Design a protein around this ligand. Structure first.
Ligand SMILES: *[C@@H]1O[C@H](CO)[C@@H](O)[C@H](O)[C@H]1NC(C)=O
Ligand SMILES: *[C@@H]1O[C@H](CO)[C@@H](O)[C@H](O)[C@H]1NC(C)=O
Lengths: 48, 48
């Protein structure tokens, strides 16, 4: 549906991590990235 | 966590190993610097 929509309050976040840690960029995750570095909301709209 | 995740020799999958754990605090934040995991998935409980 991305091609048929209009988007409000768009932001882009950028960083670099280790390959093993990519699974932690998701709602409700644990680990050091998801605890001390970068946290997503439980109710998240957007793409990773 | 040190003789489970940091053992010198692991078993073969056909004769897999089983170990009892009791009477200990489960503070896993000690593995944040120790051990990078490509897979970590929990069933019946939320990681948070
Ligand atoms: C993490 O582990 C590395 C490699 O052993 C070590 O150099 C570093 O000091 C450790 N960091 C701390 C303080 O936990
Ligand atoms: C695992 O054991 C090795 C053996 O010397 C040690 O160098 C390493 O620091 C240990 N890693 C831990 C305890 O996280």
């Amino acid at each position: 549906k991305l091609n048929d929509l209009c988007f409000t309050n768009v932001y882009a976040d950028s960083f670099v991590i280790r390959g093993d840690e990519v699974r932690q960029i998701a709602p409700g995750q644990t680990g050091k990235i998801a605890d001390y570095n970068y946290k997503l909301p439980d109710d998240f709209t957007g793409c990773v | 966590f040190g003789e489970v995740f940091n053992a010198t020799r692991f078993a073969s999958v056909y004769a897999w190993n089983r170990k009892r754990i009791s009477n200990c605090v489960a503070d896993y934040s000690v593995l944040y610097n120790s051990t990078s995991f490509s897979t970590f998935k929990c069933y019946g409980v939320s990681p948070t």
